[PDB]
Design a protein around this ligand. Structure first.
Ligand SMILES: [Cl-]
Ligand code: NI
Length: 169
């Protein structure tokens, strides 16, 4: 159920994910496994490329209490407003946190986990998460937006995290 999260520089994180074409039982299992993986990592969003599945699919739970689980399949940004700084991290760049600029408000259209079209508008953390998720589906990671010095620092923190995990029994 709980799948391993991939870390930079895994090239599977850099692929352009393919649209979901088939809503079958395997897709529901994938969605359920992604939720389990996201909750285990104590995250609020997870994109399929982050577990090695090259599909334009993400799961979201902003509050964390499973009361409003969001699944976005084949999302497209229909509109956005404003631009502001966010202090941001990423489950696929563990240990590295920095400031990036994204839209302040975004409206996304997608299919839900059963294929029904819906639209969602977000501000704050939800807006940040939606844009971060779509970036993952396009092979983009937040460190790509940083200065060379800050990207180098992020990689150093990531490498320290990896070394620490490898020392565990
Ligand atoms: Cl993430
Ligand atoms: Ni991420």
């Amino acid at each position: 159920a709980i799948r391993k999260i991939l870390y930079l520089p895994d090239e599977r994180l850099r692929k352009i994910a393919k649209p979901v074409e088939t809503f079958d039982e395997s897709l529901q299992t994938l969605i359920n496994d992604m939720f389990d993986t996201m909750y285990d990592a104590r995250g609020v969003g997870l994109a399929a490329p982050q577990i090695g599945v090259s599909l334009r699919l993400s799961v979201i739970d902003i509050v964390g209490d499973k009361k409003e689980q969001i699944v976005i399949v084949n999302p497209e940004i229909v509109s956005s407003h404003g631009e502001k700084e966010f202090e941001e991290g990423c489950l696929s760049v563990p240990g590295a946190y920095d400031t990036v600029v994204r839209a302040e408000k975004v409206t996304v259209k997608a299919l839900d986990r059963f294929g029904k079209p819906f639209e969602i508008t977000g501000e704050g953390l939800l807006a940040e998460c939606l844009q971060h998720e779509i970036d993952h589906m396009n092979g983009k990671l937040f460190v790509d937006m940083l200065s060379p010095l800050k990207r180098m620092m992020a990689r150093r923190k990531l490498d320290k995290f990896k070394r620490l995990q490898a020392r565990k029994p």
